[PDB]
């Protein structure tokens, strides 16, 4: 769709490499470590999808 079709997504980063035939349903925000992240944040705490 022209400027649409958002229903298809993929994870850019993860806490660790996914195991064979694994599947992570959760979409929790990755932790940055250098700063607390409970809400949205910057460098590493972006929405993984």
């Amino acid at each position, epitope marked *: *769709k*022209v400027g649409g*079709n*958002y*229903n298809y997504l993929y994870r850019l980063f993860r806490k660790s490499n996914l195991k064979p035939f694994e599947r992570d349903i959760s979409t929790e925000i990755y932790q940055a470590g250098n700063k607390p992240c409970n*809400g*949205v944040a910057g460098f590493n705490c972006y929405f993984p999808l």
Partner: antibody
Amino acid sequence: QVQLVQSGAEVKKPGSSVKVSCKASGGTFSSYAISWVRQAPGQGLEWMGRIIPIFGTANYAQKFQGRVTITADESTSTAYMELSSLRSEDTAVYYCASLASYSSGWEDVFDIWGQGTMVTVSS
Amino acid sequence: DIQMTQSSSLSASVGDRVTITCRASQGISSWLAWYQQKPGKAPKLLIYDASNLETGVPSRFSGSGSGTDFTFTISSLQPEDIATYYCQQYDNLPLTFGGGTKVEIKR
């Protein structure tokens, strides 16, 4: 569980700007996507635009760009809608609904709807 | 641009079968939905995939068709069917809805 609530009715002069919004209650602002759709008296539903609060992507209909502007935030968790240089024909009720096409292989349908915001224009 | 036309007003008694279609100029890739709505109220989604019903709506409501055609159907009318129904296209970004077919309980 997700549910939406809209603002109250409004009345203003032609040629002015009208501001209306809807609360992104239930679920989370990150796992939610909002889209505004117009329904005029004597007409079916009609699209105004879409906004994904977490992605920040927005678009409009080919006949309401500029005339209509869309914005959203997380501090308030709501989609902001502003219609400028509104005509007298802009007297209609605006809806704010959930955009399902945002995640997990769903499609561009509206599973949850708000109540409705009636905007009337008269002298 | 893509558009549609529902075909506008109906009247039926409890128990009979009714069918409605929303034609279009170009083949919609089965990306069509149908809503229930009282005139001037928040609609309720019934059909989102051409052959899959949403949670909460009974099997009494149904639909069929694919491509450049579709047909919404109620296997049997009931007094709760006093409302209008809207055919919606979502094949592309410029979302558009139908004019809305209205079926009235027939006395």
